[PDB]
Design a protein around this ligand. Structure first.
Ligand SMILES: CC[C@H](C)CN(C[C@@H](O)[C@H](Cc1ccccc1)NC(=O)O[C@H]1CO[C@H]2OCC[C@H]21)S(=O)(=O)c1ccc([C@H](O)CO)cc1
Lengths: 99, 99
């Protein structure tokens, strides 16, 4: 679809078999989701945002469907203020900015 | 143009008579710019993201050119690590997400 930006670009995602709402975030390199239970192995990692750095759990090669488009990539889980879909997955679904 | 998301969507902006590089950020409601000493009145604000909050100065009706597209709106100035063009200005330049 074509998504205008007068409202937050929020979309439904499927991850670990569960539906969630997430923000399409072109300013995020990576995808960061709020605390949740995910199956598989993970590794401790750090990520920095506008306010500093936080600890996250890094899940690699995770299936995630974004607005009906399938992706398989890295998902970071930790105390992010909002579920954000970053460029690592936006590229997989063929997302571009246009003006 | 069409901007792919393999790398950060950085573009040149003009604000306060200065040229800067900034992110086209669909995940930001508002525009946040690196410390700069703009003239005029401002109001204090605190904005939160990954890592926590930073203190910024809110300037209203600021002229800003993004890739030759003119816009006018609110800009928040503070110790952000990167210049962020938010939806309040992205809509004014006709920017959309597409996939
Ligand atoms: C809550 C949803 C978002 C986190 C919100 N942010 C926008 C994001 O795009 C942010 C931009 C960014 C910040 C710092 C460095 C590089 C990019 N990217 C980000 O954190 O990405 C993370 C994951 O991937 C990595 O790559 C870059 C960092 C890592 S924000 O800046 O904190 C913000 C909060 C409130 C408002 C209000 O509108 C003010 O009024 C405007 C903007």
């Amino acid at each position: 679809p074509q998504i205008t930006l007068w409202k937050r670009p929020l979309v439904t995602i499927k991850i670990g078999g569960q539906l969630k709402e997430a923000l399409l975030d072109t300013g995020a390199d990576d995808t960061v989701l709020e605390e949740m239970n995910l199956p598989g192995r993970w590794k401790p990692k750090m990520i920095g945002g506008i306010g500093g750095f936080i600890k996250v759990r890094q899940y690699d090669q995770i299936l995630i469907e974004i607005c009906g488009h399938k992706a398989i990539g890295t998902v970071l889980v930790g105390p992010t203020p909002v579920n954000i879909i970053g460029r690592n997955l936006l590229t997989q679904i063929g997302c571009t900015l246009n003006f």
